[PDB]
Sequence to fold (180 residues):
Amino acid sequence: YSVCDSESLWVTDKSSAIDIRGHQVTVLGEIVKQYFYETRCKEGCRGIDDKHWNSQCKTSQTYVRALTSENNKLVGWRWIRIDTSCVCAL
Amino acid sequence: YSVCDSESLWVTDKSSAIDIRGHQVTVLGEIVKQYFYETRCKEGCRGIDDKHWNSQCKTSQTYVRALTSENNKLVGWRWIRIDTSCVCAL
Fold:
C-alpha cells in the first residue's frame, strides 16, 4: 500500500517544456520518436498521523535530457523537467 | 517536511543498466556526454500512524531513454530504468 496514489503513462504529445534555466523550449518530435514516461499524482496521505500532522500528496519532477530548440534553430540537448512521482508533504 | 528523505545527484559514471525488457545493456558515454540525474532514498516514515500502520521508505525508479548497446555493436536508444524518487510504503 502507498501513502499517495499515482498514475504512470507514456506521453507522445509533449511539444513544450521548461528547461533547467527556467526557459520555455520547444521539444522536438524525433531524434526514432521522442516521447516520455511520466508519473504524476492521481488524487491527506494514507497512514499519516493527522493529529499534529497535516499532509497532502504532491507530484514531484526531475530532469531528463530532451532534444529541444528555442526560437526554432538552436536544436540540441537540454535538461527539461517532467513529472516523475507522487510524494507526501507534512 | 517530507515523509521520506532523499538525495539527488548527477551521475557521470553509469556504464551498465537494466532496460525495459530486463536485459543488461551497456550505457554509452557520449551521444555531448551522456549523464543522468537521479534521486534516491537517503536513510518508519515521518508523520505515519505506526499504530496499525507499518512503513518503510523505498526508492522508486522510472524509464528514460539512453543511448546503449548490447554485446557492443547494436547501438541505439532503449528505455533504461534509474532512481527517480523516494516514497513511503505502508
